[PDB]
Design a binder for this molecule. Sequence first.
Ligand SMILES: CCO[C@H](COc1ccc(C(F)(F)F)cc1)CSc1ccc(OCC(=O)O)c(C)c1
Length: 257
Amino acid sequence: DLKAFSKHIYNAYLKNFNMTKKKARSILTGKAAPFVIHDIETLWQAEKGLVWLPPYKEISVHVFYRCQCTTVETVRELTEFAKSIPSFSSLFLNDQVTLLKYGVHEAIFAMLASIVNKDGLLVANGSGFVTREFLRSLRKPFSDIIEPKFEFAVKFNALELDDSDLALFIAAIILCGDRPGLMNVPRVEAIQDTILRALEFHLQANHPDAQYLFPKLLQKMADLRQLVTEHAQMMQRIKKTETETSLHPLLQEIYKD
Ligand SMILES: CCO[C@H](COc1ccc(C(F)(F)F)cc1)CSc1ccc(OCC(=O)O)c(C)c1
């Protein structure tokens, strides 16, 4: 009943996300190799065929838009993921939307670490590997909202979670009971309570030697809330100073507050 729960969440995660941390760690290590993107030339080569939108303006903004395309696809998967949780789908549709609105970016940044290492991150289903040196090389606004994700991603991967753990972690992130405008708060805190109790139970079997892992994850959850807050501010500034830069409508609604 409680392991049936974690098993169900683990299947929805497997079923709804094309890139898992298992696949990702296979590619980064070398089981099988992706095409390295580290400057204008290699990005263009990847943009043709090889690896793979508004009109191309500059490099820093071109990456920005690719970030948005990736964000939009993950938001699609996370929506199907949340819906595959029967308890979730039983909330009223407007509560479902409030949960996703304030949850996806936290979840997205949590899952980013699965496809990241100290040197770069996988893109397009793992066919390419954008380097961190390149992303530091971008213009001053756009190179700022990427580096913190690495800093978080490296400290998150230090915990050595696997996909079975992450499925519950993400589910816990989405079913947050203190999201602004939630209609039926107690029902959401109840589901969240089941998820965390399932997560803590699962961490015992899967990580028998992990000292203080569950409380640490809960700390990572709060750290993600802060990363998203800081990420959102840079985005708003980008909206203000980069008046010629676009924002995909779906992302406009999420941040609309
Ligand atoms: C969700 C994955 O997207 C990023 C990965 O970074 C990439 C870097 C380079 C490239 C490519 F080289 F292919 F252009 C793609 C993604 C993670 S960081 C991020 C995430 C979202 C972003 O804006 C959209 C939003 O806030 O909803 C921005 C500006 C950055």
